[PDB]
């Protein structure tokens, strides 16, 4: 009877339920994973996500075919219940997922696809711009980093020169310092690139081995090394000029030092110092040799030290006994001096420092207001 | 003529040094006879201790004292020329005058010569050196060159140019120029008039011993005026040296404490390795550390190696001037300054790296916490939805036909539930990572995840409890 | 070589790159229609 005509409706309703239910959770799983949150720190990580999205976009025509194939069964159900006018609820007793539900959910999947590729293309652009910053840093750090190392070595070499001239060493150091002052222009520009990288949240640079802190430390080291070594030259000149020896005579001593140097690293000494004594003066080499062997070092013969020990025996300086005698001739040969006397001869500016800092005489030939220049001058020299 | 000039000069020279001694002579050939005035004159011009002169009332006493004074002249060693100790007491005019010149030469002419030339050569050289720029002056001998007396006025311009009008003086009046030069010397330089002008200019050759005596007193007067220069240049030397070294010593203490204090406040900040709750706060910490390394440490690096060059030059200036070494304060020492700068640098190397490694770990937590929030809510709604359709126990009113249809509808509610298995697994996995990474809200993420997992278990058992109810209905009508 | 007053005073001798923790990215990809193998 009607059990044959109505059986086809049941076999259609079960084919719908068995096709629509798995397709529904595919769309439910696609709607969620399509608008999923991502974070990448490599160009390969965005290239893999864009590849996986192109694979999803590729199967969409096949998914639309199954979408129409599932709605074909749904339409054919409403077709045969209209064709044979059999009163029923027209709501699939097996699938609780209506055809309208699968239609609106497909529209949602359709709208998320253009969003996902525009968000992946935005992050690809971010990753491509970030890689440019990574490369920009490695371009300067791998050039500035080793440059600093070279100026460090150049300065370390100029502060260990055998052919020492001091005035030539100062002009060479003033040009190594001038190279540093015109290279800072590149380091402050590198600091700007480092800021652009760390502000882009980038801790990734395989293109370089040098960190910014490696350059920051190296630059401070170089800056404190040029300032240190320039002062060394100024100190050697200030002590040489105070020693009284002339500039040409100093270079002459450095030249005589250089040839009597077979050791090179150290000063050629022992019988070579005897060969310096034979050039000038006569004999006196038995007590003078023994004194130079004791004068090698007071505590634990040196190259620079040899130059200092030759210029040490020639000693002539101005001390306290010279100024105490000069204060006595001021006081007209008195063991004390008056405040009135100090301002009578000395310039008023320099006279007032004495009348204030000079102590009480209190000696054998005592007198009120008598200043003691013997204790004032002997304190100035320790 | 030589005796008239010796008598006036050697008397007023004796008077110039015997005014101090408290006695005066009038007749040089009579007052010196006893030897008392001669032994007193030697005590003053030398300033040394001399033997005791016997009073000389007796004839033998006078000679005994002249021999005492002449025995003192043997310590100097000066040669004796036609001189007798007896003829001094006798009153020999040529002998006494010649002996006075011996005394003037040894004490007022030999100690004058510093160019190792004895007596006249040392005094003449000084007269020629001091009268070199003067064109109208010519000094070659101590007699005809002194006779004009225009070079004596030039000598007073050589040390006091402000006191004399050199321009007015000419050779037309030798008498008046000599008179004027002796009045200036007597009224200001305290050199009494020993040479008479009228007598010298008339005579063709004046006595060299008398002229040399007058010049020696002029040299002696200007010896202390030029000695003031030695005293001024040495006091200016040691005062400028001690004032500069003391100023530079005060700048070391000033710069050492200023640097020491900046290191004191930037050391705790640099060694605070306690991270913040948000990546925004730590990224802020990185920018203020970036400002420190770009605009705060670089000048303090210059002031550290400026303190080194300043201390270096300070110890050199003291060493080259024989002054003792500079000793800084207990806290502002060399080892204390380098020691504090060493403490500062260790803290700054870790601080960079650490800050990034905190920023990155926060970056992940900030993302995974938001992702979890999003996945938890989309599941919470889905789970609530499926929970209610199972709570509707409307299946008890059904026939075997409706029951078998309801079983295939519940079969779909089972397979679709199993699809959301890895969704719940993902929620549990990303909450586990927030707990392992010490997220600040990992106590409330664990509650939201535990409640979701405890409900998912009940959802699953309730799913299988309703299948068993439908199966109990299908196998009921079957029999 | 050339001694410094600063070095002798403090006690000078007279004669002489970060591996980051790796992370399990929880990035998810939507299932393409059919299977995952294609």
Map A346-381 to HEC letters: CCHHHHHHHHHHCCECCCCCCCCCCECHHHHHHHHC
Angle at C36 between CA C31 and CA C38, to 5 degrees: 120
Whether B334 and chain C come into contact, CB under 8 Å, resolves to yes
- The reply to whether residue C18 touches residue A34, judged by beta carbons under 8 angstroms, is no
Interface subset of A 168-227, CB within 8 angstroms of B: 188, 191, 195, 198, 201, 203, 211, 213, 216-217, 220, 223-224, 227
Q: Are residues B353 and B373 in the same domain?
A: no
Q: Which of A32, A23, A101 is nearest to A65 (CA)?
A: A23
* CA–CA separation, B92 and B33 (whole Å): 9
* CA–CA separation, A229 and C5 (whole Å): 12
Place of tokens 């008397």: B11
Start-to-end C-alpha separation, chain C: 75
Out of C5, C20, C28, name the one closest to residue B315 (CB).
C5
CATH classification at residue B427:
1.20.58.60
Place of tokens 């800084």: B328
Residue A156, both tokens: 């370390």
Mutate to test the interface with C, among B332, B342, B364 (most CBs of C within 10 A): B364
- The reply to whether residue B239 touches residue A201, judged by beta carbons under 8 angstroms, is no
C-beta of residue B273 within 8 angstroms of C-beta of residue B353? no
Distances (CA, A) of A165 to A247, A253, A262, B313, B320: 8, 10, 20, 20, 21
* CA–CA separation, A202 and A277 (whole Å): 69
* CA–CA separation, B97 and B103 (whole Å): 10
Q: How far is B352 from chain C (nearest CA, A)?
A: 11
Q: How many CB atoms neighbour CB B462 within 10 A?
A: 13
Q: Which of A20, A16, A37, A14 is nearest to A105 (CA)?
A: A20
Mutate to test the interface with C, among A59, A70, A217, A301 (most CBs of C within 10 A): A59
Mutate to test the interface with C, among A41, A55, A70, A106 (most CBs of C within 10 A): A55
Q: Which of B73, B93, B69 is nearest to B11 (CA)?
A: B93
Cα B126 versus chain centre, distance? 43
Q: How many CA atoms lie within 13 A of B410 on its CB side?
A: 24
Interface subset of B 343-362, CB within 8 angstroms of C: 353, 357, 360-361
Start-to-end C-alpha separation, chain B: 186
C-beta of residue B376 within 8 angstroms of C-beta of residue B452? yes
What is the DSSP code (8-state) at residue A286?
S
* CA–CA separation, A319 and A317 (whole Å): 7
* CA–CA separation, B411 and C24 (whole Å): 36
- The reply to whether residue A228 touches residue C4, judged by beta carbons under 8 angstroms, is yes
Q: What are phi and psi of A130, to 5 degrees?
A: -70, -35
Q: Which of A81, A102, A87, A84 is nearest to A13 (CA)?
A: A81
* CA–CA separation, B470 and B397 (whole Å): 11
**What is the CATH T-level fold of the domain A320-381, as seen in this structure?**
Recoverin; domain 1 (1.10.238)
Residues 6+ apart with CB under 8 A from B92: B29, B84
- The reply to whether residue A220 touches residue B298, judged by beta carbons under 8 angstroms, is yes
What is the DSSP code (8-state) at residue A261?
-
C-beta of residue A305 within 8 angstroms of C-beta of residue C3? no
Residue C11, both tokens: 């006690």
Distances (CA, A) of A226 to A219, A233, B334, B432, C4: 11, 11, 20, 55, 14
Residues 6+ apart with CB under 8 A from A233: A166, A169, A170, A173, C2
Residue B233, both tokens: 């240049």
* CA–CA separation, A219 and B222 (whole Å): 65
* CA–CA separation, A95 and B413 (whole Å): 10
Place of tokens 């109208």: B136
Burial of B304 (0-12, 13-18, 19+ CB in 10 A): buried
Mutate to test the interface with B, among A95, A216, A357 (most CBs of B within 10 A): A216
What is the DSSP code (8-state) at residue C31?
P
Ligand-binding site membership of A36 (annotated): no
Its sign, for the CA torsion B337, B340, B346, B347, is negative
The three-state DSSP-derived secondary structure of chain B is CHHHHHHHHHHHHHHHHHHHHCCCCCCHHHHCCCCHHHHHHHHHHHCCCCCCCCCCCCHHHHHHHHHHHHHHHHHHCCCCCCCCCHHHHHCCHHHHHHHHHHHHHHHHHHCCCCCCCCCHHHHHHHHHHHCCCCCCCCCCCCCHHHHCCHHHHHHHHHHCCCCCCCCCCCCCCHHHHHHHHHHHHHHCCCCCCCCCHHHHHHCCCCCHHHHHHHHHHHHHHHHHHHHHHHHHHHHHHHHHHHHHHHHHHHHHHHHHHHHHHHHHHHHHHHCCCCCCCCHHHHHHHHHHHHHHHHHCHHHHHHHHHHHHHHHHHHHHHHHHCCCCCCCCCCCCCHHHHHHHHHHHHHHHHHHHHHHHHHHHHHHHHHHHHHHHHHHHHHHHHHHHHHHHHHHCCHHHCCCHHHHHHHHHHHHHHHHHHHHCHHHHHHHHHHHHHHHHCCCCCHHHHHHHHHHHHHHHHHHHHHHHHHHHHHHHHHHHHCC
Distances (CA, A) of A293 to A46, A112, A274, B48: 76, 93, 12, 50
C-beta of residue B365 within 8 angstroms of C-beta of residue C26? no
CATH classification at residue B150:
1.10.418.10
* CA–CA separation, A179 and A186 (whole Å): 12
CATH class of A133-236: mainly alpha
C-beta of residue B69 within 8 angstroms of C-beta of residue B33? no
Whether B304 and chain A come into contact, CB under 8 Å, resolves to yes
C-beta of residue B161 within 8 angstroms of C-beta of residue B148? no
User: Resolution (in Å) of the shown entry?
Assistant: 3.2
Q: How many CB atoms neighbour CB A314 within 10 A?
A: 9
* CA–CA separation, B93 and A132 (whole Å): 119
Its sign, for the CA torsion A290, A296, A298, A304, is positive
Burial of B214 (0-12, 13-18, 19+ CB in 10 A): buried
- Given B193, B222, B239, the domain boundary residue is B239
Q: Which residues pair with A371 in a beta bridge?
A: A337, A360
Out of B334, B426, B430, name the one closest to residue C9 (CB).
B334
C-beta of residue A45 within 8 angstroms of C-beta of residue A123? no
What is the DSSP code (8-state) at residue A163?
S
Angle at B44 between CA B40 and CA B49, to 5 degrees: 80
Place of tokens 């006081």: A331
Residue A204, both tokens: 């990734």
Q: Which residue of A has its CA nearest to B420?
A: A29
- The reply to whether residue A227 touches residue B305, judged by beta carbons under 8 angstroms, is yes
Q: How many CB atoms neighbour CB B321 within 10 A?
A: 17
Q: Are residues B156 and B262 in the same domain?
A: no
Residues of chain A with CATH 1.10.238.10: 237-311, 320-381
* Interface A:C, Cβ pairs < 8 A: 66
Q: How far is C1 from chain A (nearest CA, A)?
A: 6
Ligand-binding site membership of A261 (annotated): yes
Method: X-ray
Place of tokens 């608008």: A35
Distances (CA, A) of A175 to A251, B114, B160: 21, 52, 54
Interface subset of B 229-258, CB within 8 angstroms of A: 230-232, 234-239, 242-243
Q: Where do the H-state alpha helices sit in A295-335?
A: 303-310, 320-328
Q: Where do the H-state alpha helices sit in A59-183?
A: 60-83, 99-158, 167-181
What is the DSSP code (8-state) at residue A27?
H
Q: How far is A38 from chain B (nearest CA, A)?
A: 9
Residue B51, both tokens: 């033997």
- The reply to whether residue B334 touches residue C23, judged by beta carbons under 8 angstroms, is no
Q: Are residues B409 and B431 in the same domain?
A: yes
Residue B47, both tokens: 């300033």
Q: How many CB atoms neighbour CB A311 within 10 A?
A: 16
Distances (CA, A) of B150 to A84, B139, B143, B171, B196: 165, 10, 13, 7, 15
* CA–CA separation, B50 and B65 (whole Å): 11
Cα A196 versus chain centre, distance? 16
- The reply to whether residue B408 touches residue A213, judged by beta carbons under 8 angstroms, is no
Q: How far is A37 from chain B (nearest CA, A)?
A: 6
Q: Are residues B296 and B401 in the same domain?
A: no
Out of A96, A224, A318, name the one closest to residue B305 (CB).
A224
DSSP string for A197-251:
HHHTT----TT-S--HHHHHHHHHHHHHHHHHHHHHHHHHHHHHHHTT--HHHHH
Residues 6+ apart with CB under 8 A from B220: B108, B112
Residues 6+ apart with CB under 8 A from A114: none
Q: Are residues B87 and B2 in the same domain?
A: yes
Q: Are residues B235 and B253 in the same domain?
A: no
Q: How many CB atoms neighbour CB A19 within 10 A?
A: 16
Q: How far is B459 from chain C (nearest CA, A)?
A: 25
C-beta of residue B307 within 8 angstroms of C-beta of residue B256? yes
Q: Are residues B44 and B129 in the same domain?
A: no
Q: Are residues B382 and B401 in the same domain?
A: yes
* CA–CA separation, A23 and A35 (whole Å): 19
* CA–CA separation, A114 and B344 (whole Å): 55
Q: Which of B338, B266, B346 is nearest to B307 (CA)?
A: B338
Indicate the SS3 state at residue C32: coil
Helix (H), strand (E) counts: chain A: 16, 0
What is the DSSP code (8-state) at residue A337?
B
- The reply to whether residue A32 touches residue B423, judged by beta carbons under 8 angstroms, is yes
Its sign, for the CA torsion A21, A23, A27, A30, is positive
Q: Which of B455, B400, B466, B386 is nearest to B427 (CA)?
A: B455
Range A2-132 has CATH code 2.30.130.10: no
Whether C31 and chain B come into contact, CB under 8 Å, resolves to no
C-beta of residue B438 within 8 angstroms of C-beta of residue B274? no
Architecture of the domain made up of A237-311: Orthogonal Bundle (1.10)
* CA–CA separation, B60 and B86 (whole Å): 10
Burial of B421 (0-12, 13-18, 19+ CB in 10 A): exposed
Indicate the SS3 state at residue A205: coil
Whether A315 and chain B come into contact, CB under 8 Å, resolves to no
**Structural Rg of chain A based on CA atoms:** 49
Q: Are residues B88 and B150 in the same domain?
A: no
Indicate the SS3 state at residue A19: helix
Work out how many domains chain B is built from and give that number.
Answer: 4
- The reply to whether residue B239 touches residue A350, judged by beta carbons under 8 angstroms, is yes
Instruction: Spell out which residues of chain B touch residue A244, defining contact as CB-CB under 8 Å.
Output: none
Burial of A176 (0-12, 13-18, 19+ CB in 10 A): middle
* CA–CA separation, A74 and B107 (whole Å): 150
Start-to-end C-alpha separation, chain A: 136
- The reply to whether residue C6 touches residue B312, judged by beta carbons under 8 angstroms, is yes
* CA–CA separation, A382 and B325 (whole Å): 9
What is the DSSP code (8-state) at residue A245?
-
- The reply to whether residue A58 touches residue C32, judged by beta carbons under 8 angstroms, is yes
Q: Domain span at residue B331?
A: 240-364
Whether B379 and chain A come into contact, CB under 8 Å, resolves to no
Residue A270, both tokens: 């022992």
Out of A63, A228, A300, name the one closest to residue C33 (CB).
A63
Residues of chain A with CATH 1.20.58.60: 2-132, 133-236
* CA–CA separation, A300 and B258 (whole Å): 36
Instruction: Spell out which residues of chain B touch residue A345, defining contact as CB-CB under 8 Å.
Output: 228, 231-232
- The reply to whether residue B371 touches residue C26, judged by beta carbons under 8 angstroms, is yes
Point out residues after which chain C has a gap (C–N over 2.5 Å). 16
Ligand-binding site membership of A179 (annotated): no
- Given B205, B239, B273, the domain boundary residue is B239
Residues 6+ apart with CB under 8 A from B476: none
Ligand-binding site membership of A299 (annotated): yes
Place of tokens 């310092």: A177
**Structural Rg of chain B based on CA atoms:** 59
- Given B111, B144, B178, the domain boundary residue is B111
* CA–CA separation, B283 and B286 (whole Å): 5
Residue B178, both tokens: 């000599």
Q: Are residues B64 and B122 in the same domain?
A: no
Q: Which residue of B has its CA nearest to C8?
A: B334
Q: Are residues B375 and B344 in the same domain?
A: no
Ligand-binding site membership of A272 (annotated): yes
- The reply to whether residue A232 touches residue C2, judged by beta carbons under 8 angstroms, is yes
What is the DSSP code (8-state) at residue A54?
H
- The reply to whether residue B370 touches residue A37, judged by beta carbons under 8 angstroms, is yes
C-beta of residue A26 within 8 angstroms of C-beta of residue A97? no
* CA–CA separation, A354 and A346 (whole Å): 10
Residues found in chain C? 38
Residues 6+ apart with CB under 8 A from A208: A137, A138, A141, A142
Out of B301, B389, B408, name the one closest to residue A94 (CB).
B408
Instruction: Spell out which residues of chain C touch residue A300, defining contact as CB-CB under 8 Å.
Output: 14
Distances (CA, A) of B208 to A176, A353, B48, B150, B316: 72, 49, 28, 17, 57
Q: How does A91-104 read in b/e, with b if 16+ C-beta sit within 10 Å?
A: ebbbbbbebeebee
- The reply to whether residue B312 touches residue C28, judged by beta carbons under 8 angstroms, is no
* Interface B:C, Cβ pairs < 8 A: 32
């Amino acid at each position: 009877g009607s059990s044959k005509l109505l059986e086809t409706i049941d076999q259609l309703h079960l084919e719908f339920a068995k096709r629509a239910a798995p397709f529904n959770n595919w769309m439910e799983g696609a709607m969620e994973d399509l608008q999923d949150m991502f974070i990448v720190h490599s160009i390969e990580e965005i290239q893999s996500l864009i590849t996986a999205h192109e694979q999803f976009k590729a199967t969409l025509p096949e998914a639309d075919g199954e979408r129409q194939s599932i709605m074909a069964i749904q339409n054919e159900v409403e077709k045969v219940i209209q064709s044979y006018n059999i009163r029923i609820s027209s709501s699939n007793p097996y699938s609780t997922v209506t055809m309208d539900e699968l239609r609106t959910k497909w529209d949602k999947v359709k709208q998320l696809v253009p969003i996902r590729d525009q968000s992946l293309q935005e992050e690809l652009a971010r990753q491509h711009a970030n890689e440019r910053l990574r490369r920009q840093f490695a371009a300067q750090a791998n050039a500035i980093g080793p440059w600093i190392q070279n100026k460090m070595e150049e300065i370390a070499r100029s502060s260990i020169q055998i052919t020492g001239a001091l005035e030539d060493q100062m002009n060479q150091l003033k040009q190594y310092e001038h190279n540093i002052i015109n290279y800072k222009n590149n380091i402050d520009k590198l600091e700007g690139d480092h800021q652009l990288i760390q502000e882009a949240l980038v801790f990734d640079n395989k293109h370089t081995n040098y960190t910014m802190e490696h350059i920051r430390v190296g630059w401070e080291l170089l800056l404190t090394t040029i300032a240190r070594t320039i002062n060394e030259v100024e100190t050697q000149i200030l002590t040489r000029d105070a020693k009284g020896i002339t500039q040409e005579q100093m270079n002459e001593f450095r030249a005589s030092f250089n040839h009597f140097d077979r050791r090179k690293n150290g000063l050629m000494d022992h019988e070579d110092f005897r060969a310096c004594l034979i050039s000038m003066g006569y004999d006196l080499g038995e007590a003078e040799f023994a004194r130079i062997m004791t004068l090698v070092d007071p505590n634990g013969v040196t190259f620079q030290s040899f130059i200092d020990f030759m210029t040490r025996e020639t000693a002539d300086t101005d001390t306290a006994e010279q100024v105490i005698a000069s204060f006595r001739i001021l006081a007209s040969d008195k063991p004390y001096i008056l405040a009135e006397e100090l301002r009578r001869e000395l310039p008023p500016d320099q006279a007032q420092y004495c009348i204030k800092r000079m102590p009480a005489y209190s000696g054998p030939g005592s007198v009120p207001g008598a200043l003691d220049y013997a204790a004032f001058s002997s304190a100035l020299y320790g | 003529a030589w005796e008239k000039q010796q008598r006036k000069t050697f008397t007023a020279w004796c008077n110039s040094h015997l005014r101090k001694a408290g006695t005066q002579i009038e007749n040089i050939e009579e007052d010196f006879r006893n030897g008392l005035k001669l032994m007193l004159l030697l005590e003053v011009i030398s300033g040394e201790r001399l033997p005791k002169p016997d009073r000389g009332k007796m004839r033998f006493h006078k000679i005994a004292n002249v021999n005492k004074a002449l025995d003192y002249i043997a310590s100097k060693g000066v040669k004796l020329v036609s001189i007798g100790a007896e003829e001094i007491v006798d009153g020999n005019v040529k002998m006494t005058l010649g002996m006075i010149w011996t005394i003037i030469l040894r004490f007022a002419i030999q100690d004058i010569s510093v160019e190792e030339t004895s007596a006249k050569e040392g005094l003449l050289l000084w007269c020629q050196r001091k009268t070199a720029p003067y064109r109208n002056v010519n000094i070659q001998n101590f007699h005809t060159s002194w006779k004009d007396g225009l070079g004596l006025c030039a000598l007073i311009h050589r040390h006091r140019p402000d006191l004399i009008d050199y321009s007015k003086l000419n050779k037309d009046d030798p008498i008046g120029n000599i008179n004027l030069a002796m009045e200036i010397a007597e009224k200001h330089l305290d050199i009494p008039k020993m040479l008479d002008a009228e007598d010298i200019v008339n005579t063709p050759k004046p006595d060299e011993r008398a002229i040399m005596t007058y010049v020696s007193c002029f040299y002696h007067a200007f010896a202390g005026a030029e000695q003031a220069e030695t005293a001024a240049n040495r006091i200016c030397k040691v005062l400028a040296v001690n004032q500069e070294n003391e100023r530079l010593m005060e700048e070391y203490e000033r710069l050492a404490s200023e640097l020491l204090e900046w290191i004191r406040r930037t050391i705790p900040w640099l060694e605070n390795r306690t991270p913040e709750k948000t990546m925004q706060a730590m990224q802020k910490k990185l920018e203020d550390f970036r400002d420190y390394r770009r605009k705060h440490k670089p000048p303090k690096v210059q002031e550290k190696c400026q303190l080194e060059i300043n201390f270096n030059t300070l110890q050199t200036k003291l060493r080259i001037s024989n002054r003792p070494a500079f000793m800084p304060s207990e806290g502002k020492m060399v080892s204390d300054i380098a020691g504090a700068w060493q403490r500062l640098e260790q803290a700054e190397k870790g601080y960079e790296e650490w800050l990034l490694n905190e920023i990155r770990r926060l970056e992940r937590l900030e993302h995974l916490a938001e992702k979890f929030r999003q996945k938890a809510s989309t599941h919470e709604t889905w789970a609530y939805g499926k929970e209610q359709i199972l709570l509707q126990k409307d299946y008890e009113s059904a026939s075997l036909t409706e029951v078998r249809a309801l079983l295939r509808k519940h079969e779909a509610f089972e397979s679709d539930l199993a699809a959301h298995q890895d969704r719940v697994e993902q929620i549990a996995a990303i909450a586990q990572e927030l707990n392992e990474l010490d997220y600040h809200d990992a106590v409330n993420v664990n509650d939201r995840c535990q409640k979701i997992c405890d409900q998912w278990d009940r959802l699953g058992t309730l799913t299988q409890k309703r299948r068993e109810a439908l199966e109990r209905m299908s196998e009921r009508v079957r029999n | 070589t050339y001694i410094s007053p600063w070095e002798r005073a403090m006690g000078v001798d007279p004669q002489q790159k970060a591996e980051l923790p790796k992370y399990k990215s929880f990035n998810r990809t939507a299932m393409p229609y059919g299977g995952y193998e294609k």
